[model samples]
Target: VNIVDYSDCFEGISGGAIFCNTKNKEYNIYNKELIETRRSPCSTFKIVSTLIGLEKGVINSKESVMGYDGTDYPNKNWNKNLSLEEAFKESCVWYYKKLINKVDAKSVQNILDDLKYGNCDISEWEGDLKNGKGHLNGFWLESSLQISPKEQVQTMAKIFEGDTNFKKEHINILRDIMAIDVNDANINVYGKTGTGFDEKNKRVDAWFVGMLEREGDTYYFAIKSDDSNKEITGPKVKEIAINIIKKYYS
Candidate 1:
């Protein structure tokens, strides 16, 4: 196993990371246990929401229309109109919230149960819940959703292969969302970027999760950082991830 100091690679970074080959079943580099335990998923969980929305008929293709006035959250700034694809590409929180509300908790729970994702417990936050309140009136606040590097990689593989219970088209949509520049000779990659506030650490966590494809084989990669001091941005995370991809795949 090769050890990498991500903090050295990017100053002011501390989070879990995983890289694996879905085609060949190999782990190139990984360091998850050394970091703090798993916390709220931030926007990384949106990928799951996207998949569920598609599979449950909550929304059509990426071109489906949606609106976000942000009336519920007075602080939200949002565009009036957006397409499903554009919502994901732009990471529109309002658009997703609207869609999720339409789908309702029962449908979302059903999708999660069908997929057997993350312990299959969905009642923690169901009916009559405030948007951002603690999960279930402090009853489930202490229950953290834990996901290890190995488990994450395996889930990615299952999604890539369309082995999960979700429809194949749902998987394709996820692939499309993560699509990045693939023409570069040094490396071919696709991924999604995530950023959100971490209350416990009083920092912002940034994440990049995706796969590299070459010669009919695919490799999964995940890189994350805690930008507590506001030193890192999404582009910086992409740059670091690209360099790591090139170092291994090139």
Candidate 2:
């Protein structure tokens, strides 16, 4: 557990970090306390949203297809109609919005609280709630819902190990959709990337999180970096994580 040298991988980046894998006792880099400090989940919370959607029958499965509103969302990749698998991989914000409409804020919040998710505050996503002023959506984008790097890995582990109440098939779909790359069938990499902005509308938080299954070991990890520009996009987060994970395999 050392400060990975890949911090130089992107520009305008300050204080980027890797994760604390529970399976490896000898590995640790960043401070444990700070790792637990809460921050907005951005799009990373979609993992929870997708799971809830599947469990609540919001759609059906990863292969379930749906249409986009064609309203031109903030991200260009979300324009096309896509299946759950496609939407999850792309971190399509609008896709989850539709999913949430079916699952509803109460259900989403219940799971967060039941699972003891970071901060466990979905109030912002509830939108213009009782005595609170939250937009219809974008709570995780720029709201009070926050989680620490430490717990993010924990939740990923629960998903990997089926520690939650979700059915096995649903969990399997999640693991399957997360696959990013395959190496010789024995080594596969999976991850989710999230980018968010600060109140000033500046990009501040980015995450690359998931697990790497290799040599029969399921190693979970999370990466969150600070910056407010092109420095913290999804692709950059993915690239740095893959490079950092590759070193262990080599």
Candidate 3:
């Protein structure tokens, strides 16, 4: 009987790559094509929204109040005020939707185009396509946006260095939004999560994009899986990602 090293095999099970860079040293693997393919960015896109709000002064500070409108709360009211920091910590969609509506479609499209974050065809995937209208009349479809893992990582690196075209303050706001609480180590892990439903495969693709830092150095990583089973949940997907990170950083 033979026992195989699962560590090496785990990398082969998923579709995305993990990248690490410390004090100018770096390592990465997986199909280059998969890294380049663009899929739905999911909540990860929320980071962009946060940046837009900050850049426009729509949000004054991390403690600025943003109302929640989700139905989970009574009377469709969240009942609690959310600072930008709190909204990010909770991944509150309602707060972002309100912010987006305030930013308006044109401004959103312009910023996205200027940043080259994704496509600008706003009407391609908008509206309830299931209806007789077939497609959104004026809005763009977020599904059309695509990004490569390499590009994702590159953008993240620039962000960490505060080199983006946006003001440094706005960039810092985004940096803070990406911060993740490391319960075990009491350290902050700044990153974002994305979930996309693939109609063709009848499954959901899960993604996590962000950087982990220790001392003063940071390493950026992106993980993605398009498993066809409902048994997979976001946290489960995140655990798989943590295992990969542990293999490299531990």
lDDT winner: 2
Q: Write the per-residue lDDT of candidate 2 for residues 1-250, one digit (tens) a residue.
A: 5544544444336534545455664344443544666778778887888888888987788888656767756677778888899898777767787777776677878888877789988766653234243333566766778898778887888777778898899888888888877344666887788876565445577788788877856777777766656556656777777766776543
Ranking by lDDT: 2, 3, 1
Best model per TM-score:
2
Error of 1 at 23 (Å): 2.9
List candidate 2 segments past 4 Å from native. Answer: 1-12, 16-27, 31-34, 70-77, 126-136, 182-186, 200-203, 228-230
Candidate 1 residue 171 C-alpha distance from true site, Å = 2.0
1-250: candidate 1 lDDT, tens digit per residue: 3555455455446554667775566665545562323443445556677877787787867777665543454433344466777777777666776666677667766765565455534455432244364221211121233333344455667777778887777778777767888457656687777655555567755667677887777887777666675656555677777766666576
Please give the CA lDDT of all the candidate structures: 0.61, 0.71, 0.62
* 1 or 2, greater by TM-score: 2
| Better structure of 2 and 3 per lDDT | 2
Candidate 1 wrongly placed segments (more than 4 Å): 1-8, 34-36, 68-77, 113-116, 119-150, 182-186, 233-235
- Which model, 1 or 3, shows the larger lDDT? 3
TM-score of each model, in listed order: 0.77, 0.83, 0.77
